[PDB]
């Protein structure tokens, strides 16, 4: 079946797989194949939505001294973009300390909380994201941030793309286009029950029905 046409493909890929297809198995197989094939210094990043899937993938992959990021997409920005390069973009007064109640409905108040209160902000409206817009803002203001992101990873694995806001799409597409980093997207179109958290199913469907540089496969197993 098509499960052998994926491991042999290197580049941008989609996998439109429904429930019970075995997304985790193919994701782990592709990750292991990519790591075994490549002999350079580059790494991979696997971004999920829950800590359970992150820990499952961490356990399945094993142990290595190569630095690969496995975790949630909210931890990705905090660990890679915001915490290291916040002061290089805005200034030395902006703090890199935070332990995240104090949500608001404006972007400026988020920076105000992060600076004065010294705690990561949030939003009251679930249709807008503060983390993934601040991350993209930092990426466009810091040259060393973009340099590190380009020098670090050669592929990023994304799962459950249907439950993604517009800011997540913006950041991922910025990475794909402006920084020339490959993407591996897996998602079920009919699993948008998380729409109560601001999920936008239109992004995955638009990618499926309009993307020209994406290779598309479907799994019925």
């Amino acid at each position: 079946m098509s499960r052998e046409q994926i491991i042999k493909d290197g580049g941008n890929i989609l996998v439109t797989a429904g429930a019970g297809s075995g997304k985790t198995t193919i994701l782990v197989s592709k990750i292991e194949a990519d790591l075994k094939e490549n002999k350079t210094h580059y790494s991979i990043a696997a971004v999920t939505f829950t800590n359970k899937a992150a820990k499952e993938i961490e356990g399945r992959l094993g142990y290595s001294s190569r630095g690969n990021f496995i975790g949630t997409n909210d931890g990705f920005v905090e660990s890679e973009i915001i915490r290291p390069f916040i002061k290089d973009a805005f200034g030395n007064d902006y703090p890199d300390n935070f332990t995240a109640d104090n949500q608001f409905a404006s972007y400026d108040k988020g920076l105000q909380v992060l600076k004065y209160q010294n705690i990561l902000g949030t939003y009251s409206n679930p249709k807008k994201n503060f983390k993934f817009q601040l991350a993209l803002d930092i990426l466009k203001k810091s040259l060393v941030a973009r340099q590190y992101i380009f020098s670090k990873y050669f592929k990023i694995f994304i799962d459950e793309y249907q439950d993604s806001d517009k800011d997540m799409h913006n950041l991922f597409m910025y990475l794909k286009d402006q920084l020339k980093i490959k993407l591996f997207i897996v998602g079920d179109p009919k699993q948008s029950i998380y729409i109560w958290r601001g999920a936008e199913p239109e992004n995955f469907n638009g990618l499926i029905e309009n993307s020209t540089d994406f290779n598309k496969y479907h799994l019925t197993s």
Partner: protein, 158 residues
């Protein structure tokens, strides 16, 4: 991309020496003691099997252990676009760089003697600014700098 300079202070027979460098370097002369101590300083800075031990009382200049040993190396990161070693360095360094100083990097070594314990501890720092350096992170016996550099030592004898 390119080695630029090295400074050595209060180390063995070196008191204050500043040497310009390149990628390929040849040292010659009649001293034959400073020539070996030069390579030993390089090994201490970049070799984990030599730095694994400390500094003795004989490693300090004039055996005066009240002075501090400094060894600092400078690099040039101007060809990030055309070089893949610049990326190898930049992928382990993240935050220690600033955008105003995106073309220069520093790796430093510092040692102060402990008279009670009779030991000289070595602590490493990098940074883009020479007035603001921070410790290289690591866990256990391993360092973040050990992930980049591989030092191969060749000697016909031993």
């Amino acid at each position: 991309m390119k080695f630029s300079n090295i400074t050595i202070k209060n180390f063995r027979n070196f008191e204050k020496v500043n040497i310009n460098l390149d990628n390929k370097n040849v040292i010659f002369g009649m001293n034959d003691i400073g020539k070996t101590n030069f390579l030993y300083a390089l090994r201490f800075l970049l070799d984990k099997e030599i730095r694994k031990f400390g500094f003795n009382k004989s490693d300090y200049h004039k055996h005066d252990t009240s002075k501090k040993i400094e060894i600092i190396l400078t690099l040039d990161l101007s060809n990030y676009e055309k070089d893949e070693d610049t990326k190898k360095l930049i992928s382990v360094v993240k935050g220690a760089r600033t955008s105003a100083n995106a073309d220069v990097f520093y790796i430093a070594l510092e040692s102060k003697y402990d008279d009670k314990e009779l030991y000289g501890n070595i602590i490493l720092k990098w940074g883009s600014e020479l007035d603001n350096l921070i410790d290289i992170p690591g866990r256990g016996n391993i360092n973040a700098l050990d992930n980049v550099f591989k030092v191969i030592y060749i000697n016909p004898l031993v």
